[model samples]
Structure formats: C-alpha cells, structure tokens
Target chain A: GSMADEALFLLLHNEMVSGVYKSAEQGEVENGRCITKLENMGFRVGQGLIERFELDIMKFICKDFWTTVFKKQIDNLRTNHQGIYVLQDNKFRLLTQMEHASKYLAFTCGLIRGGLSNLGIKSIVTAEVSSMPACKFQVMIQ
Target chain B: GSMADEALFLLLHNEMVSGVYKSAEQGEVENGRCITKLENMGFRVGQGLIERFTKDTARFKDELDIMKFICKDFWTTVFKKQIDNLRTNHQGIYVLQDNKFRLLTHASKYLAFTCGLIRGGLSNLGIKSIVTAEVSSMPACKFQVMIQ
Candidate 1:
C-alpha cells in the first residue's frame, strides 16, 4: 500500500533536508538557514512543476489558481475565515500511522511556499493537523 | 553556530526515524525489546567512542581507575562538562549526574542510546555493566551504572 504520492513526497523531503540542512548550527542563523534553504528548495520545486504542468500563473487568480495549478498537488481546497485557504489531503499516505508527521510535513510546506515564490506571490504556507489521517495546509497570502 | 544545532537536530531526528523507529511489526507488543535494541546500539556507539578516545593512550589501571577515567575523560569529551556528581557503592554500582546533558531534551527512547554508550565504553574495557538513566527535571540527567 505504498503509493507513489506518499513515497515520492517522503523521499523528496528527506533528500532536501539531508542535502541542504546537513550541517546544523545553533541559534538565529540556523533557523534562518533552514527557512531560506527550504524556501529556495520549494521555489525550485515550483519552477520544475510549472515546467512539468505547463501552467501559467499569470492567467490564474485565487480560486482559479487552485483549480488550475494547485488542486493537482493535493486533494481538495477551500477558503474560509478570509485570507486563509484550507488544503485537505484525503490520500496522504506518508502520514498514515506516522507518529511525528510534522517533521515530515515541513518539506510539503516548502513545496507550496516554493511554488508560490516562483509565481512572484508572497505567501506563508504551514501544515496543520486537526484530525487523524487528514492533513490541512493553511495558506496565508500576504 | 545555528548550523551546528540544525545539523545535530537533523541527525538525531534521522536516527529516531531510521534507528529507533525502524522496527514496524513489534509496535507496542514488544516494548521492552525495543528499548533493549536501542540500548545495545548505544552501547556500540560508546564502544566506538572509547576506541577513538583511547586510541593512543590505551592504558587503564583498575575498575575504580577506569570509572575515574570515564568520569573525567569520557564525560568531558562527550558532554563538554565534568561529571557533576559521581557516587560508587564499592560493590558494582555507580551513580553519575550531569547538569547540562545536551541529549536529554527529547523522548526517552534516545536516552537508552546514551546508556548503551556508557555501558559499551565500560564493557570494552572488560568491565561488564548495565547502564540506565532518569530525568526528574529539565536538562539534568542521572545515569545509573550497575556493574554485573
């Protein structure tokens, strides 16, 4: 029951962390390093995805963007409470029976942030777990 | 500085996933066995640590002398601090306290690895012992060594 989606995500995230954040220093610089490296990695992923999907970010806005470019990455997307979008993963295989899913989900966060970064959009992407077997990604476009 | 912390966290996190949480089937049914395996792995690391440290100065006087070496040499090398407190029963039991044990921040599963390292170090010197640890407060860890 190892779906490629989950496996691919896991492998990609692990590789990113391993490759970039291999050397960890303590304090502010380390945190900044992680954020920058992950964000940049996400941007590259986004760029690669843009090439793969052959999608145009300029033509999409808000809901249109979700339907056109974002929906494929996850299962469902909806906006609630204004400026906040909820991304639900119905078939998240990597998180199945995982004890510490947040650590792994950091890379997924990077993916979203990265893609948006390439589109010249400033956004804060975070992973949230309100229920088991379900992962909700919060996107705050600022 | 922060890079080192990041590296350390990542390494420890990787070990938790690959080394500690590798076994799937055992799950909750075989809890004790899991601890045993981790401790054994830690012991192996300790043995390697000793081999690396005492590579050139491969000399120890006696059991008490070895304990003293661990208290002074091993403690300082790994923890960057001398053993805060060390008590021996003179009958195969030693209690060592560390005020700022770096590796005691997370889950107890990793603690077993440290225990194994100490036991492994002593075992390498032909001193068979069992090492266990406890944390009653934050950042302070007590390692109990029972020589058998």
Candidate 2:
C-alpha cells in the first residue's frame, strides 16, 4: 500500500529501537550511521528470508488436508560452534552451525519447516526449538 | 567492530520470518489472510517476548546455564482466548490451541536436546523424552505470558 515494502519497514523500524537494532551501544554516538549500515544489510536478508518462508516453506504443502502435524526438536551440540543466540525471547538458544553462530535462526527455521513438509508430514503444527547458546530459528512443523 | 545493535537486527529478522507471523494457510495467499495478519502481529509479540525473556528469564543465567536448565514443553490445545498467541521458533498450528498433530520424528530429536538440558539429564532425558513423545516441544520460559 505504501511506497516501501510494509513488512520490511516494520521489520527495520522495530529493529531500530527494539531488538538488536537498538544501536549506539558501547558509547557510540547515534549519528544515524549505524542505522544506515544495518538497514542496507538487513534489507537483503529480509527480502531473501521472507520469500523463502512465505512461498517456499509454507507453500511446500498446499491446503489439502484437514489436520496438520506440528513437531519440534533440538539437537545437542557436542562442540560449541558459536551459534545465533537470543536471550530476549526466553532462556533458550539454537546451535546453528555458523562457525560463530552467525547463521540466521529464523532462516534456518524456514529451511527446516520447508524440509519437513517436503518429506510429507504436512499439517498445521507448531514447534519451538532453542539451543543452549541458541540458534534462533530451528523449529520444524510436521 | 561497531557497537551498532546488529544483534538486535539479526534477532528481529530471525523472529519476523520464522513463520510466527503467518497463519495456518500461510502457504496459500487466499485462505491464509488472517493467519498472515496474526503472524504479522507476532512480529511485535516477538519483540516483546525477546525483551521479556532476556530481561526476566535470562537475567542471571549464562548461555551455558540457560542451555542446561531451559526446558520446552508441548501441549495440543483446542481452545484459545480472543487474544493472540506468539509461536516461537518452535512450531504450532492455528493458535496454540488447534486440532492438529505434528511429527518431527527427525526434527523432534534435535529439539529435545534443548529440552533435555532444561529437563536435567541430557542423554537419558533427551532420548527418553523424544522416543516417547509424539508432538512438538513447547518451552514456556518467559517471565510472563498474556493469552488474551
């Protein structure tokens, strides 16, 4: 409805003041520089991820069944591969294998959900999976 | 390098696209309009949930301690209040209460890892829990949850 992607805007705006996007930490001045940089990078990730989830994952299985199956599980990480950790939601984490855990947990969740549906356990199911150091988005619905 | 809140951006980005924003028929543009809107609302919920979890739940625990103690539980619900529900990275259908079943025979094993840590006994609890349970893992690790 607007000139910009509304979803992207809300996402970016929320990040600006709410989430990890609350910039000017470590005594840094809020000269709008950090926000500008984050906006550029986040925009790319946002566009890519939104489609994968909305179109690829959710659309993997059309609405043909009456009842959907949702399942969630977390794998144990023997090695501490710095994963994407989020303490804001709960005392949980997802051990995303991104060397330093920089991989997007939300994006990983999309992949897992998509993969599960492709495997044929399609239905309406919701699962929450978190890691110790926590990979943000690893939940899969069957 | 820069103290710019990049982590917040990543966290928000992760939560926004994590399907917590979409509805049951999210895959279908026509049948899933309400779900999409609800899931969209979850974006704000995600922001608050994260803040609450961080400030209240994870206040004193380190990452290791959290991993060791945090437990996620799963429940199939059929009734929910008029208020909305926030589905975390964990999976769900309709609201938290919906007539649906899920199987992550493969994925469930992985999620139980965190659950097991919360349940105390990584190997034994993890194996036993997943091997026994049939549905997803739900972690109610928030200091407060308002189901209106």
Candidate 3:
C-alpha cells in the first residue's frame, strides 16, 4: 500500500513537473515554500495511487469498466479525517471557525453522484473538519 | 507557487475523476489512503491557487510565459523526497531508493519544473504519460509508470 502511495506521489509529481495544464490561471502566483513542499509530496503519493488502481486493479477490468471501478474505489475509500474532515460519497461535513457547523452532505453527495453518472463507476465522497491537530489516529478513516 | 502545486494536483485529479482519458492505463496510476487524501486536499488548495493567480498574476503575461514562469517558481519549492524521484530535463539526478547522498537544492525549482510541464501538457494533450512530442511516442519512464 505504501508502495502504491509512492506510485501516486510519483504521478502527481510528474504532472506537476510536466506542466500539463498550460492555460491554468494559477500557474503564476506564489505561495511560499511549505505549500510547495506539501504539494510536491502530495502529488508523489497521488501518482502511486493512480498506478495501483490503474495498473493493479483496473488493468484487468477492461476500459469500459474504468469509470465504474474508479468510482467504487473512491466510494469505498471514503473516510473521516479527525472530526473536522469527513468524507462520504458526496457530502462534506465541516466545522466553521465561528463555531457553526455546516452540512452540505446532500449537495455534495448529489455532485459526486451526478458527476459519476454515465461514467464507468459510481462513487461517494465526503469530508468533516474538526478542531486541533490532536485528533485520534494519525489518519482517520470511515 | 504553493497554489500552483495544489492546482497541479487538482487538474490531475479532475482528469482522473472525469474519466477524460476513459481508463487508468490512459492516465497516471495512483495509490494509498494518505496520498489519495493528500491529493484531494492539494486539489482544493489548487482551486484556491487558481483563484488567486487569476486575480493577481494573469493580468500581465501571455499563457505560455505564465506557464514557464510557474514551472520555475514551483520547481524551487519541492522538498528532497519528491525531488529524489525526479529526472530533470530528462536527465537523472539521483534515486530515492539508492539513498546514497543528500543534496542541498531548493524544492521550489522542482516544483516549478513539474508545474510548468503539467500546465503545458494538460493544455496540449490532457495529461497522458509525460514526455516530449518526439519522445512521447517513444519509450521512457513516464510511459513506464503508466504501463508498469
């Protein structure tokens, strides 16, 4: 799985390097060093993920089934990060800094649900934002 | 620049989720829970980056120059971990697995390089395996990443 993680990171990093979206509006702005470091690390991990699912899981599944398999995987991987980050199919659960909680669960779900429609797979994704870096489990799932 | 990195992630993920290439083999493969989540987070960050850049930086430059500028800025921001895997201008610098020596290059340069490529690539080809027009059809590591 970690290798898979590495693969994802590689893919992301490669794309980040390749400059695939030449017209992208954000290509010019600056955000300091740390954001750049995190972005680099994040993309590297992302590439590994694409490799795992694409080469490992979906290669045998046929191109026609790509959307289906991809959506399912995303749906299955849906999880919660701390209390503030919760990932369901579409819904995103967040904690506002003002102490007010907002739930776009239905709208988000619809977005994912519709977004995946007519594609190869069906997926559900959600998120929740909690307070503090001191959450249980270095990474929280489900 | 940080936003640029995030945008790179977003564009890639959007490409993946959209089924644009219609198959995983058609795009870069991805893996892992942490990394996947990080990709998603970066995507959101990129969205913000796009917004900010559009508001601030796009006023004075052409698309191509902006793309090049982004590539360099981002290249300078990357850390050692990501840089180790990279082969600049198609040249080998070092290997992550080798773990022999450490270098003192700025991470942002790599960030700029990757970001510039993605911007140009996605604009032209929608992000298949990254390669030059001539070499793209030929064999290389990026192609291997997709095929492997």
Instruction: Encode model 3's per-residue lDDT on B10-71: one tens digit a residue.
Output: 34444333321222231243333322333333443333233323224553254334334333
Off by over 4 Å in 1: A1-142, B1-10, B17-19, B55-58
Q: Which digits, one per residue and each the tens of the lDDT, describe model 1 over residues B24-59?
A: 244532556656655765566566556655333445
TM per prediction? 0.46, 0.21, 0.22
- After TM-score superposition, the amount by which residue A1's alpha carbon in candidate 2 deviates from its true location, in angstroms, is 13
Off by over 4 Å in 2: A1-12, A15-23, A30-33, A46-142, B1-12, B15-148
What TM-score does candidate 1 get on C-alpha atoms?
A: 0.46
Candidate 2, residue A59: lDDT: 34
Arrange candidates by TM-score, descending. Answer: 1, 3, 2
User: Which 10-residue span in candidate 1 chain A carries the lowest summed lDDT?
Assistant: A1-10
Share of reference contacts kept by candidate 2: 0.00
**Residue range A17-112, candidate 1, lDDT tens digits:** 543443334552345665565554454544444333312332232233323222234566677655667778764544554534565556567656
Which digits, one per residue and each the tens of the lDDT, describe model 2 over residues A47-142?
333333332333322221100111122222121233222212222222211232232233333333334444444322222434444433322232
TM-score of chain A of each: 0.63, 0.23, 0.23
| Residue B82 miss distance in model 3 (angstroms) | 13
